[PDB]
Every structure is written in structure tokens, then in C-alpha cells.
Amino acid sequence: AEALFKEIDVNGDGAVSYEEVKAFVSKKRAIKNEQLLQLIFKSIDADGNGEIDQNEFAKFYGSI
Amino acid sequence: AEALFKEIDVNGDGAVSYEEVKAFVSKKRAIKNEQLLQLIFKSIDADGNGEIDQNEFAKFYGSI
Amino acid sequence: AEALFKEIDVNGDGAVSYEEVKAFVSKKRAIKNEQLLQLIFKSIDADGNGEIDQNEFAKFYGSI
Ligand SMILES: [Pb+2]
Ligand SMILES: [Pb+2]
Ligand SMILES: [Pb+2]
Ligand SMILES: [Pb+2]
Ligand SMILES: [Pb+2]
Ligand SMILES: [Pb+2]
């Protein structure tokens, strides 16, 4: 009755098959990678318009 | 005369080309990942019918 | 005015978009992997003809 078992159990038959654990691990990994990358971007895009201009980029670099 | 050189040497010409080392490293990696994942599954599937029901899943989690 | 911002800024509009940072990180990663692999090959291919014969392969292995 936890959303996690249901999230992994994609065809909803009450059983987590191997393919499902595998698809899950894959997408969980993909998501953590997206989140770290976005967070890094947003962190460089100091003013938040959604693009990094040469200035934001300049600050970001150096002794970093 | 070791099975390993022959395993990497896929077109069998006595020479391991770069593509072959590369294909080999790729598939070796893929296999270690499958094996760890399967072992983890089999380890959760406490009764071995090949699917994880909410119970096996429940035990598995917690302070894990 | 650094080649790096221009290298990431693929469509050249002065702005590094997210897709571009992402494509960049991907290809940077791909390249480091190629370079390490090639260096390892070249390191096994002791005489440099571009293929590893059973002999070069033999030396390479052991207590390695
Ligand atoms: Pb299922
Ligand atoms: Pb900006
Ligand atoms: Pb060959
Ligand atoms: Pb089971
Ligand atoms: Pb751009
Ligand atoms: Pb050689």
C-alpha cells in the first residue's frame, strides 16, 4: 500500500518483475543525473532567465 | 591459446583490434551490472518464484 | 571571448542553453573515456602496428 511498490510495479499486477526493477533503477538514475545537472545550471544562471551569458559563465570559472 | 584472447578477438584473425577491445570492455561492464542487479533481485525475492510481492518488498525496506 | 564558451554555445547565439550544457557534459565524458581507452590500448600494443597480438597481450597480463 506504499506508492513506491506501485511506482515500480508498472503493469500493476501486484508483482514487481525483474524488468520492472531494472527499468526503475534506470529511470531513478536518469533522474538523479538530471537533477544534479539542472541544479548546477540554475546555479550558474545567476539571474534566472534560463540561459547562461558570458558573464555568469565568467564568474563561475577561475579558482572556481 | 587462452580463451580470453579468443573471446576478445571476435573476428578471429589473431589480432585484437581497438573496436574489439572497446566492444569487450562495453559488454564486460554490461554483464557485471546485470549480475549485480540479478543478485539483488534474487536477494529480495526471498521465496524464488521470480517476482517480488509486497511482502518480500516490505521486509527488504526499513533500516534496510 | 574564450573558445570554451563558444565551444559549449553550439548554435552561436551568445547564450549557453541547458540542452547545450547537457550535450557538452555528455561529449566531454565520452571523450575522456575514449582517451583513457586508447591510451590503455596503445599501452598494450607495445610495438605500435595498431593491433594486439597474443604476445603483447600475454605480457600485459599476470600479476599485470
Ligand atoms: Pb508488475
Ligand atoms: Pb542568465
Ligand atoms: Pb581480431
Ligand atoms: Pb517472491
Ligand atoms: Pb546558444
Ligand atoms: Pb602489436
Side-chain angles (χ1 to χ4, degrees):
Chain A
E2 64 211 308
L4 184 60
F5 183 102
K6 280 177 127 292
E7 200 196 332
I8 299 172
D9 175 23
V10 152
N11 70 341
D13 64 27
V16 168
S17 70
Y18 180 66
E19 298 44 330
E20 299 181 331
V21 145
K22 186 175 176 193
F24 181 74
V25 163
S26 287
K27 133 183 154 167
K28 175 195 185 187
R29 177 187 306 129
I31 291 169
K32 308 314 160 189
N33 284 356
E34 282 293 324
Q35 297 176 335
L36 178 56
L37 192 52
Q38 297 195 12
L39 180 159
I40 288 177
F41 181 81
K42 193 22 224 110
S43 175
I44 297 179
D45 175 353
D47 68 45
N49 62 350
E51 299 203 311
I52 299 163
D53 57 55
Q54 324 200 327
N55 202 247
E56 298 167 326
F57 182 93
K59 286 160 191 260
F60 179 76
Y61 273 85
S63 293
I64 322 94
Chain B
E2 64 211 308
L4 184 59
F5 183 102
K6 280 177 127 292
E7 200 196 332
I8 299 172
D9 175 23
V10 152
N11 70 341
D13 64 27
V16 168
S17 70
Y18 180 66
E19 298 44 330
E20 299 181 331
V21 145
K22 186 175 176 193
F24 181 74
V25 163
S26 287
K27 133 183 154 167
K28 175 195 185 187
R29 177 187 306 129
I31 291 169
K32 308 314 160 189
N33 284 356
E34 282 293 324
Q35 297 176 335
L36 178 56
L37 192 52
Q38 297 195 12
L39 180 159
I40 288 177
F41 181 81
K42 193 22 224 110
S43 175
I44 297 179
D45 175 353
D47 68 45
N49 62 350
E51 299 203 311
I52 299 163
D53 57 55
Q54 324 200 327
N55 202 247
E56 298 167 326
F57 182 93
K59 286 160 191 260
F60 179 76
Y61 273 85
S63 293
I64 322 94
Chain C
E2 64 211 308
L4 184 59
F5 183 102
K6 280 177 127 292
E7 200 196 332
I8 299 172
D9 175 23
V10 152
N11 70 341
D13 64 27
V16 168
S17 70
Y18 180 66
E19 298 44 330
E20 299 181 331
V21 145
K22 186 175 176 193
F24 181 74
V25 163
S26 287
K27 133 183 154 167
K28 175 195 185 187
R29 177 187 306 129
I31 291 169
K32 308 314 160 189
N33 284 356
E34 282 293 324
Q35 297 176 335
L36 178 56
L37 192 52
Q38 297 195 12
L39 180 159
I40 288 177
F41 181 81
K42 193 22 224 110
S43 175
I44 297 179
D45 175 353
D47 68 45
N49 62 350
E51 299 203 311
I52 299 163
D53 57 55
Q54 324 200 327
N55 202 247
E56 298 167 326
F57 182 93
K59 286 160 191 260
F60 179 76
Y61 273 85
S63 293
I64 322 94

PDB file of all heavy atoms in Angstrom, chain A residues 1-37:
ATOM      1  N   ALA A   1       0.807  -1.229   0.000  1.00  0.00           N
ATOM      2  CA  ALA A   1       0.000   0.000   0.000  1.00  0.00           C
ATOM      3  C   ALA A   1       0.851   1.295   0.000  1.00  0.00           C
ATOM      4  O   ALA A   1       0.332   2.400   0.241  1.00  0.00           O
ATOM      5  CB  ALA A   1      -1.032  -0.006   1.172  1.00  0.00           C
ATOM      6  N   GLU A   2       2.154   1.148  -0.258  1.00  0.00           N
ATOM      7  CA  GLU A   2       3.030   2.312  -0.450  1.00  0.00           C
ATOM      8  C   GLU A   2       3.175   2.648  -1.941  1.00  0.00           C
ATOM      9  O   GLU A   2       3.205   1.745  -2.806  1.00  0.00           O
ATOM     10  CB  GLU A   2       4.415   2.143   0.218  1.00  0.00           C
ATOM     11  CG  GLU A   2       5.316   1.014  -0.331  1.00  0.00           C
ATOM     12  CD  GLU A   2       6.229   0.438   0.765  1.00  0.00           C
ATOM     13  OE1 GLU A   2       6.932   1.235   1.437  1.00  0.00           O
ATOM     14  OE2 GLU A   2       6.219  -0.801   0.974  1.00  0.00           O
ATOM     15  N   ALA A   3       3.262   3.949  -2.219  1.00  0.00           N
ATOM     16  CA  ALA A   3       3.284   4.447  -3.583  1.00  0.00           C
ATOM     17  C   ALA A   3       4.515   3.935  -4.297  1.00  0.00           C
ATOM     18  O   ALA A   3       4.530   3.860  -5.519  1.00  0.00           O
ATOM     19  CB  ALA A   3       3.287   5.969  -3.591  1.00  0.00           C
ATOM     20  N   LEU A   4       5.555   3.604  -3.538  1.00  0.00           N
ATOM     21  CA  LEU A   4       6.786   3.101  -4.129  1.00  0.00           C
ATOM     22  C   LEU A   4       6.625   1.743  -4.808  1.00  0.00           C
ATOM     23  O   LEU A   4       7.089   1.559  -5.937  1.00  0.00           O
ATOM     24  CB  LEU A   4       7.864   3.013  -3.055  1.00  0.00           C
ATOM     25  CG  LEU A   4       9.244   2.593  -3.547  1.00  0.00           C
ATOM     26  CD1 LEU A   4       9.714   3.591  -4.571  1.00  0.00           C
ATOM     27  CD2 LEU A   4      10.224   2.582  -2.386  1.00  0.00           C
ATOM     28  N   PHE A   5       5.927   0.806  -4.168  1.00  0.00           N
ATOM     29  CA  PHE A   5       5.771  -0.519  -4.775  1.00  0.00           C
ATOM     30  C   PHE A   5       4.953  -0.374  -6.037  1.00  0.00           C
ATOM     31  O   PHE A   5       5.215  -1.048  -7.023  1.00  0.00           O
ATOM     32  CB  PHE A   5       5.110  -1.508  -3.820  1.00  0.00           C
ATOM     33  CG  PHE A   5       4.987  -2.898  -4.381  1.00  0.00           C
ATOM     34  CD1 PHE A   5       5.873  -3.879  -3.982  1.00  0.00           C
ATOM     35  CD2 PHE A   5       3.972  -3.248  -5.253  1.00  0.00           C
ATOM     36  CE1 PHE A   5       5.791  -5.177  -4.480  1.00  0.00           C
ATOM     37  CE2 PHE A   5       3.890  -4.540  -5.762  1.00  0.00           C
ATOM     38  CZ  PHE A   5       4.805  -5.502  -5.368  1.00  0.00           C
ATOM     39  N   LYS A   6       3.959   0.511  -5.994  1.00  0.00           N
ATOM     40  CA  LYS A   6       3.080   0.782  -7.131  1.00  0.00           C
ATOM     41  C   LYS A   6       3.846   1.487  -8.251  1.00  0.00           C
ATOM     42  O   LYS A   6       3.544   1.305  -9.423  1.00  0.00           O
ATOM     43  CB  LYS A   6       1.901   1.664  -6.699  1.00  0.00           C
ATOM     44  CG  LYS A   6       0.722   0.968  -5.989  1.00  0.00           C
ATOM     45  CD  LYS A   6      -0.316   1.999  -5.577  1.00  0.00           C
ATOM     46  CE  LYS A   6      -1.715   1.652  -6.076  1.00  0.00           C
ATOM     47  NZ  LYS A   6      -1.910   1.713  -7.556  1.00  0.00           N
ATOM     48  N   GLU A   7       4.788   2.349  -7.871  1.00  0.00           N
ATOM     49  CA  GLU A   7       5.600   3.094  -8.827  1.00  0.00           C
ATOM     50  C   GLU A   7       6.499   2.114  -9.568  1.00  0.00           C
ATOM     51  O   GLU A   7       6.718   2.262 -10.769  1.00  0.00           O
ATOM     52  CB  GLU A   7       6.429   4.154  -8.111  1.00  0.00           C
ATOM     53  CG  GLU A   7       6.911   5.263  -9.038  1.00  0.00           C
ATOM     54  CD  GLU A   7       8.020   6.087  -8.424  1.00  0.00           C
ATOM     55  OE1 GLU A   7       8.033   6.162  -7.170  1.00  0.00           O
ATOM     56  OE2 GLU A   7       8.853   6.668  -9.176  1.00  0.00           O
ATOM     57  N   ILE A   8       7.071   1.145  -8.856  1.00  0.00           N
ATOM     58  CA  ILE A   8       7.923   0.177  -9.531  1.00  0.00           C
ATOM     59  C   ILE A   8       7.069  -0.795 -10.343  1.00  0.00           C
ATOM     60  O   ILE A   8       7.408  -1.124 -11.487  1.00  0.00           O
ATOM     61  CB  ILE A   8       8.764  -0.628  -8.538  1.00  0.00           C
ATOM     62  CG1 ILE A   8       9.674   0.299  -7.768  1.00  0.00           C
ATOM     63  CG2 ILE A   8       9.660  -1.642  -9.239  1.00  0.00           C
ATOM     64  CD1 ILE A   8      10.372  -0.391  -6.676  1.00  0.00           C
ATOM     65  N   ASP A   9       5.955  -1.232  -9.752  1.00  0.00           N
ATOM     66  CA  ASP A   9       5.017  -2.177 -10.369  1.00  0.00           C
ATOM     67  C   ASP A   9       4.249  -1.456 -11.468  1.00  0.00           C
ATOM     68  O   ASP A   9       3.118  -1.008 -11.284  1.00  0.00           O
ATOM     69  CB  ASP A   9       4.074  -2.717  -9.299  1.00  0.00           C
ATOM     70  CG  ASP A   9       3.013  -3.600  -9.856  1.00  0.00           C
ATOM     71  OD1 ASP A   9       3.245  -4.147 -10.945  1.00  0.00           O
ATOM     72  OD2 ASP A   9       1.959  -3.762  -9.200  1.00  0.00           O
ATOM     73  N   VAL A  10       4.899  -1.315 -12.611  1.00  0.00           N
ATOM     74  CA  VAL A  10       4.323  -0.586 -13.735  1.00  0.00           C
ATOM     75  C   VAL A  10       3.097  -1.182 -14.424  1.00  0.00           C
ATOM     76  O   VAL A  10       2.209  -0.408 -14.817  1.00  0.00           O
ATOM     77  CB  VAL A  10       5.414  -0.245 -14.783  1.00  0.00           C
ATOM     78  CG1 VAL A  10       4.834  -0.133 -16.183  1.00  0.00           C
ATOM     79  CG2 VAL A  10       6.103   1.026 -14.376  1.00  0.00           C
ATOM     80  N   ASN A  11       2.982  -2.511 -14.526  1.00  0.00           N
ATOM     81  CA  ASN A  11       1.790  -3.020 -15.183  1.00  0.00           C
ATOM     82  C   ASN A  11       0.705  -3.312 -14.154  1.00  0.00           C
ATOM     83  O   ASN A  11      -0.347  -3.859 -14.477  1.00  0.00           O
ATOM     84  CB  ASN A  11       2.095  -4.258 -16.004  1.00  0.00           C
ATOM     85  CG  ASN A  11       2.420  -5.443 -15.148  1.00  0.00           C
ATOM     86  OD1 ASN A  11       2.755  -5.290 -13.982  1.00  0.00           O
ATOM     87  ND2 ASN A  11       2.268  -6.642 -15.702  1.00  0.00           N
ATOM     88  N   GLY A  12       0.958  -2.893 -12.918  1.00  0.00           N
ATOM     89  CA  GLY A  12       0.007  -3.045 -11.833  1.00  0.00           C
ATOM     90  C   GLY A  12      -0.516  -4.412 -11.430  1.00  0.00           C
ATOM     91  O   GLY A  12      -1.605  -4.464 -10.867  1.00  0.00           O
ATOM     92  N   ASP A  13       0.240  -5.493 -11.603  1.00  0.00           N
ATOM     93  CA  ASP A  13      -0.325  -6.786 -11.242  1.00  0.00           C
ATOM     94  C   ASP A  13       0.020  -7.290  -9.847  1.00  0.00           C
ATOM     95  O   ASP A  13      -0.236  -8.462  -9.544  1.00  0.00           O
ATOM     96  CB  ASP A  13       0.049  -7.871 -12.263  1.00  0.00           C
ATOM     97  CG  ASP A  13       1.551  -8.166 -12.331  1.00  0.00           C
ATOM     98  OD1 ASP A  13       2.274  -7.974 -11.330  1.00  0.00           O
ATOM     99  OD2 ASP A  13       1.996  -8.712 -13.369  1.00  0.00           O
ATOM    100  N   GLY A  14       0.537  -6.401  -8.992  1.00  0.00           N
ATOM    101  CA  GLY A  14       0.884  -6.780  -7.632  1.00  0.00           C
ATOM    102  C   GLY A  14       2.258  -7.385  -7.436  1.00  0.00           C
ATOM    103  O   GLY A  14       2.664  -7.651  -6.307  1.00  0.00           O
ATOM    104  N   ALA A  15       2.917  -7.701  -8.549  1.00  0.00           N
ATOM    105  CA  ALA A  15       4.244  -8.306  -8.576  1.00  0.00           C
ATOM    106  C   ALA A  15       5.247  -7.383  -9.269  1.00  0.00           C
ATOM    107  O   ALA A  15       4.963  -6.810 -10.337  1.00  0.00           O
ATOM    108  CB  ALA A  15       4.196  -9.640  -9.301  1.00  0.00           C
ATOM    109  N   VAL A  16       6.425  -7.254  -8.654  1.00  0.00           N
ATOM    110  CA  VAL A  16       7.491  -6.448  -9.251  1.00  0.00           C
ATOM    111  C   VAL A  16       8.322  -7.449 -10.070  1.00  0.00           C
ATOM    112  O   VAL A  16       8.998  -8.286  -9.499  1.00  0.00           O
ATOM    113  CB  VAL A  16       8.375  -5.773  -8.183  1.00  0.00           C
ATOM    114  CG1 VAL A  16       9.583  -5.228  -8.849  1.00  0.00           C
ATOM    115  CG2 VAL A  16       7.624  -4.636  -7.602  1.00  0.00           C
ATOM    116  N   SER A  17       8.324  -7.344 -11.403  1.00  0.00           N
ATOM    117  CA  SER A  17       9.098  -8.314 -12.188  1.00  0.00           C
ATOM    118  C   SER A  17      10.494  -7.778 -12.263  1.00  0.00           C
ATOM    119  O   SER A  17      10.673  -6.596 -11.927  1.00  0.00           O
ATOM    120  CB  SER A  17       8.506  -8.536 -13.588  1.00  0.00           C
ATOM    121  OG  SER A  17       8.684  -7.401 -14.405  1.00  0.00           O
ATOM    122  N   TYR A  18      11.437  -8.543 -12.830  1.00  0.00           N
ATOM    123  CA  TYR A  18      12.830  -8.118 -12.941  1.00  0.00           C
ATOM    124  C   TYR A  18      13.027  -6.940 -13.865  1.00  0.00           C
ATOM    125  O   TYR A  18      13.716  -5.985 -13.513  1.00  0.00           O
ATOM    126  CB  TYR A  18      13.692  -9.289 -13.405  1.00  0.00           C
ATOM    127  CG  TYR A  18      15.131  -8.943 -13.552  1.00  0.00           C
ATOM    128  CD1 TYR A  18      15.919  -8.607 -12.466  1.00  0.00           C
ATOM    129  CD2 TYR A  18      15.684  -8.884 -14.810  1.00  0.00           C
ATOM    130  CE1 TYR A  18      17.256  -8.248 -12.644  1.00  0.00           C
ATOM    131  CE2 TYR A  18      16.990  -8.524 -15.009  1.00  0.00           C
ATOM    132  CZ  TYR A  18      17.787  -8.211 -13.935  1.00  0.00           C
ATOM    133  OH  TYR A  18      19.096  -7.850 -14.172  1.00  0.00           O
ATOM    134  N   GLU A  19      12.385  -6.997 -15.014  1.00  0.00           N
ATOM    135  CA  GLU A  19      12.390  -5.938 -15.992  1.00  0.00           C
ATOM    136  C   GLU A  19      11.941  -4.651 -15.257  1.00  0.00           C
ATOM    137  O   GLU A  19      12.436  -3.574 -15.553  1.00  0.00           O
ATOM    138  CB  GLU A  19      11.438  -6.240 -17.142  1.00  0.00           C
ATOM    139  CG  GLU A  19      11.660  -7.493 -18.067  1.00  0.00           C
ATOM    140  CD  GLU A  19      12.015  -8.820 -17.393  1.00  0.00           C
ATOM    141  OE1 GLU A  19      12.645  -8.818 -16.314  1.00  0.00           O
ATOM    142  OE2 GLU A  19      11.654  -9.881 -17.967  1.00  0.00           O
ATOM    143  N   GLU A  20      10.915  -4.750 -14.425  1.00  0.00           N
ATOM    144  CA  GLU A  20      10.441  -3.564 -13.724  1.00  0.00           C
ATOM    145  C   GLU A  20      11.440  -2.995 -12.714  1.00  0.00           C
ATOM    146  O   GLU A  20      11.589  -1.758 -12.602  1.00  0.00           O
ATOM    147  CB  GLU A  20       9.113  -3.876 -13.059  1.00  0.00           C
ATOM    148  CG  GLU A  20       8.068  -4.268 -14.033  1.00  0.00           C
ATOM    149  CD  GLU A  20       6.775  -4.541 -13.365  1.00  0.00           C
ATOM    150  OE1 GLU A  20       6.798  -4.962 -12.192  1.00  0.00           O
ATOM    151  OE2 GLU A  20       5.739  -4.319 -14.010  1.00  0.00           O
ATOM    152  N   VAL A  21      12.174  -3.863 -12.032  1.00  0.00           N
ATOM    153  CA  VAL A  21      13.158  -3.331 -11.087  1.00  0.00           C
ATOM    154  C   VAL A  21      14.221  -2.637 -11.903  1.00  0.00           C
ATOM    155  O   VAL A  21      14.636  -1.522 -11.577  1.00  0.00           O
ATOM    156  CB  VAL A  21      13.825  -4.443 -10.213  1.00  0.00           C
ATOM    157  CG1 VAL A  21      15.259  -4.133  -9.911  1.00  0.00           C
ATOM    158  CG2 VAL A  21      13.095  -4.589  -8.913  1.00  0.00           C
ATOM    159  N   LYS A  22      14.567  -3.262 -13.016  1.00  0.00           N
ATOM    160  CA  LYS A  22      15.585  -2.774 -13.910  1.00  0.00           C
ATOM    161  C   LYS A  22      15.252  -1.450 -14.595  1.00  0.00           C
ATOM    162  O   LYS A  22      16.081  -0.535 -14.632  1.00  0.00           O
ATOM    163  CB  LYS A  22      15.854  -3.875 -14.939  1.00  0.00           C
ATOM    164  CG  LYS A  22      16.963  -3.659 -15.902  1.00  0.00           C
ATOM    165  CD  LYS A  22      17.136  -4.892 -16.741  1.00  0.00           C
ATOM    166  CE  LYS A  22      18.198  -4.674 -17.799  1.00  0.00           C
ATOM    167  NZ  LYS A  22      18.107  -5.778 -18.793  1.00  0.00           N
ATOM    168  N   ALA A  23      13.999  -1.286 -14.976  1.00  0.00           N
ATOM    169  CA  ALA A  23      13.518  -0.065 -15.619  1.00  0.00           C
ATOM    170  C   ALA A  23      13.488   1.030 -14.599  1.00  0.00           C
ATOM    171  O   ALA A  23      13.795   2.191 -14.876  1.00  0.00           O
ATOM    172  CB  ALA A  23      12.150  -0.279 -16.199  1.00  0.00           C
ATOM    173  N   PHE A  24      13.205   0.615 -13.382  1.00  0.00           N
ATOM    174  CA  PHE A  24      13.116   1.532 -12.283  1.00  0.00           C
ATOM    175  C   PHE A  24      14.464   2.081 -11.896  1.00  0.00           C
ATOM    176  O   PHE A  24      14.595   3.274 -11.679  1.00  0.00           O
ATOM    177  CB  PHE A  24      12.475   0.868 -11.087  1.00  0.00           C
ATOM    178  CG  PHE A  24      12.337   1.777  -9.912  1.00  0.00           C
ATOM    179  CD1 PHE A  24      11.387   2.770  -9.899  1.00  0.00           C
ATOM    180  CD2 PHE A  24      13.185   1.653  -8.832  1.00  0.00           C
ATOM    181  CE1 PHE A  24      11.265   3.601  -8.820  1.00  0.00           C
ATOM    182  CE2 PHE A  24      13.062   2.471  -7.752  1.00  0.00           C
ATOM    183  CZ  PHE A  24      12.106   3.451  -7.743  1.00  0.00           C
ATOM    184  N   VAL A  25      15.437   1.200 -11.733  1.00  0.00           N
ATOM    185  CA  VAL A  25      16.784   1.602 -11.388  1.00  0.00           C
ATOM    186  C   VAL A  25      17.307   2.522 -12.491  1.00  0.00           C
ATOM    187  O   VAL A  25      17.946   3.561 -12.206  1.00  0.00           O
ATOM    188  CB  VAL A  25      17.672   0.358 -11.267  1.00  0.00           C
ATOM    189  CG1 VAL A  25      19.137   0.718 -11.323  1.00  0.00           C
ATOM    190  CG2 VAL A  25      17.329  -0.395  -9.976  1.00  0.00           C
ATOM    191  N   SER A  26      16.986   2.191 -13.741  1.00  0.00           N
ATOM    192  CA  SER A  26      17.441   3.035 -14.834  1.00  0.00           C
ATOM    193  C   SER A  26      16.894   4.447 -14.771  1.00  0.00           C
ATOM    194  O   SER A  26      17.650   5.443 -14.807  1.00  0.00           O
ATOM    195  CB  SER A  26      17.069   2.432 -16.178  1.00  0.00           C
ATOM    196  OG  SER A  26      17.886   1.326 -16.456  1.00  0.00           O
ATOM    197  N   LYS A  27      15.591   4.540 -14.584  1.00  0.00           N
ATOM    198  CA  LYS A  27      14.987   5.849 -14.539  1.00  0.00           C
ATOM    199  C   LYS A  27      15.266   6.626 -13.263  1.00  0.00           C
ATOM    200  O   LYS A  27      15.385   7.858 -13.285  1.00  0.00           O
ATOM    201  CB  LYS A  27      13.463   5.698 -14.774  1.00  0.00           C
ATOM    202  CG  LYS A  27      12.589   6.470 -13.813  1.00  0.00           C
ATOM    203  CD  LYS A  27      11.070   6.283 -13.993  1.00  0.00           C
ATOM    204  CE  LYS A  27      10.347   6.542 -12.612  1.00  0.00           C
ATOM    205  NZ  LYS A  27       8.827   6.701 -12.604  1.00  0.00           N
ATOM    206  N   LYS A  28      15.536   5.930 -12.185  1.00  0.00           N
ATOM    207  CA  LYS A  28      15.859   6.596 -10.936  1.00  0.00           C
ATOM    208  C   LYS A  28      17.223   7.305 -11.143  1.00  0.00           C
ATOM    209  O   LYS A  28      17.407   8.490 -10.802  1.00  0.00           O
ATOM    210  CB  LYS A  28      15.934   5.566  -9.795  1.00  0.00           C
ATOM    211  CG  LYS A  28      16.390   6.080  -8.434  1.00  0.00           C
ATOM    212  CD  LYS A  28      16.775   4.898  -7.486  1.00  0.00           C
ATOM    213  CE  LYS A  28      17.114   5.387  -6.062  1.00  0.00           C
ATOM    214  NZ  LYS A  28      17.638   4.275  -5.226  1.00  0.00           N
ATOM    215  N   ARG A  29      18.139   6.578 -11.786  1.00  0.00           N
ATOM    216  CA  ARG A  29      19.499   7.043 -12.092  1.00  0.00           C
ATOM    217  C   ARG A  29      19.463   8.253 -13.038  1.00  0.00           C
ATOM    218  O   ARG A  29      20.165   9.281 -12.843  1.00  0.00           O
ATOM    219  CB  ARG A  29      20.277   5.884 -12.727  1.00  0.00           C
ATOM    220  CG  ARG A  29      21.691   6.195 -13.170  1.00  0.00           C
ATOM    221  CD  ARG A  29      22.345   5.024 -13.961  1.00  0.00           C
ATOM    222  NE  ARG A  29      22.386   3.678 -13.359  1.00  0.00           N
ATOM    223  CZ  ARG A  29      21.960   2.565 -13.987  1.00  0.00           C
ATOM    224  NH1 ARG A  29      21.409   2.656 -15.209  1.00  0.00           N
ATOM    225  NH2 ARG A  29      22.070   1.357 -13.411  1.00  0.00           N
ATOM    226  N   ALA A  30      18.615   8.129 -14.053  1.00  0.00           N
ATOM    227  CA  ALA A  30      18.472   9.193 -15.013  1.00  0.00           C
ATOM    228  C   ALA A  30      18.009  10.459 -14.356  1.00  0.00           C
ATOM    229  O   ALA A  30      18.564  11.530 -14.578  1.00  0.00           O
ATOM    230  CB  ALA A  30      17.504   8.798 -16.071  1.00  0.00           C
ATOM    231  N   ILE A  31      17.049  10.318 -13.464  1.00  0.00           N
ATOM    232  CA  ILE A  31      16.504  11.460 -12.765  1.00  0.00           C
ATOM    233  C   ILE A  31      17.510  12.130 -11.841  1.00  0.00           C
ATOM    234  O   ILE A  31      17.605  13.347 -11.830  1.00  0.00           O
ATOM    235  CB  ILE A  31      15.273  11.033 -11.978  1.00  0.00           C
ATOM    236  CG1 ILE A  31      14.149  10.676 -12.942  1.00  0.00           C
ATOM    237  CG2 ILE A  31      14.871  12.107 -10.977  1.00  0.00           C
ATOM    238  CD1 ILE A  31      12.994  10.010 -12.288  1.00  0.00           C
ATOM    239  N   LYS A  32      18.294  11.354 -11.097  1.00  0.00           N
ATOM    240  CA  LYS A  32      19.267  11.975 -10.191  1.00  0.00           C
ATOM    241  C   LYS A  32      20.289  12.750 -11.011  1.00  0.00           C
ATOM    242  O   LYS A  32      20.760  13.823 -10.598  1.00  0.00           O
ATOM    243  CB  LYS A  32      19.984  10.928  -9.330  1.00  0.00           C
ATOM    244  CG  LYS A  32      19.069   9.992  -8.585  1.00  0.00           C
ATOM    245  CD  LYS A  32      17.927  10.754  -7.908  1.00  0.00           C
ATOM    246  CE  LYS A  32      16.725   9.845  -7.562  1.00  0.00           C
ATOM    247  NZ  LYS A  32      15.549  10.658  -7.095  1.00  0.00           N
ATOM    248  N   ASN A  33      20.612  12.226 -12.193  1.00  0.00           N
ATOM    249  CA  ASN A  33      21.571  12.909 -13.053  1.00  0.00           C
ATOM    250  C   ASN A  33      20.977  14.234 -13.577  1.00  0.00           C
ATOM    251  O   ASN A  33      21.649  15.278 -13.544  1.00  0.00           O
ATOM    252  CB  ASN A  33      21.963  11.979 -14.198  1.00  0.00           C
ATOM    253  CG  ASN A  33      22.938  10.873 -13.749  1.00  0.00           C
ATOM    254  OD1 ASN A  33      23.378  10.852 -12.588  1.00  0.00           O
ATOM    255  ND2 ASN A  33      23.229   9.920 -14.649  1.00  0.00           N
ATOM    256  N   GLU A  34      19.713  14.207 -14.017  1.00  0.00           N
ATOM    257  CA  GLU A  34      19.058  15.430 -14.486  1.00  0.00           C
ATOM    258  C   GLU A  34      19.061  16.450 -13.353  1.00  0.00           C
ATOM    259  O   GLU A  34      19.476  17.580 -13.526  1.00  0.00           O
ATOM    260  CB  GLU A  34      17.596  15.182 -14.899  1.00  0.00           C
ATOM    261  CG  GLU A  34      17.367  14.535 -16.257  1.00  0.00           C
ATOM    262  CD  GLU A  34      17.782  15.439 -17.446  1.00  0.00           C
ATOM    263  OE1 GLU A  34      17.607  16.688 -17.366  1.00  0.00           O
ATOM    264  OE2 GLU A  34      18.271  14.890 -18.474  1.00  0.00           O
ATOM    265  N   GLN A  35      18.600  16.051 -12.179  1.00  0.00           N
ATOM    266  CA  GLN A  35      18.529  16.981 -11.070  1.00  0.00           C
ATOM    267  C   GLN A  35      19.845  17.621 -10.682  1.00  0.00           C
ATOM    268  O   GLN A  35      19.906  18.820 -10.408  1.00  0.00           O
ATOM    269  CB  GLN A  35      17.917  16.283  -9.873  1.00  0.00           C
ATOM    270  CG  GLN A  35      16.501  15.862 -10.183  1.00  0.00           C
ATOM    271  CD  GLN A  35      15.850  15.072  -9.080  1.00  0.00           C
ATOM    272  OE1 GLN A  35      16.517  14.426  -8.266  1.00  0.00           O
ATOM    273  NE2 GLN A  35      14.545  15.224  -8.976  1.00  0.00           N
ATOM    274  N   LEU A  36      20.917  16.856 -10.716  1.00  0.00           N
ATOM    275  CA  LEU A  36      22.185  17.453 -10.359  1.00  0.00           C
ATOM    276  C   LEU A  36      22.585  18.447 -11.429  1.00  0.00           C
ATOM    277  O   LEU A  36      23.062  19.550 -11.114  1.00  0.00           O
ATOM    278  CB  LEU A  36      23.253  16.386 -10.173  1.00  0.00           C
ATOM    279  CG  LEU A  36      24.632  16.942  -9.847  1.00  0.00           C
ATOM    280  CD1 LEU A  36      24.628  17.831  -8.631  1.00  0.00           C
ATOM    281  CD2 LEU A  36      25.632  15.800  -9.693  1.00  0.00           C
ATOM    282  N   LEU A  37      22.407  18.052 -12.692  1.00  0.00           N
ATOM    283  CA  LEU A  37      22.770  18.923 -13.797  1.00  0.00           C
ATOM    284  C   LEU A  37      21.961  20.216 -13.770  1.00  0.00           C
ATOM    285  O   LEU A  37      22.534  21.284 -13.808  1.00  0.00           O
ATOM    286  CB  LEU A  37      22.531  18.216 -15.125  1.00  0.00           C
ATOM    287  CG  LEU A  37      23.168  18.959 -16.301  1.00  0.00           C
ATOM    288  CD1 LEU A  37      24.661  19.265 -16.050  1.00  0.00           C
ATOM    289  CD2 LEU A  37      22.972  18.196 -17.607  1.00  0.00           C
TER     290      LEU A  37
END
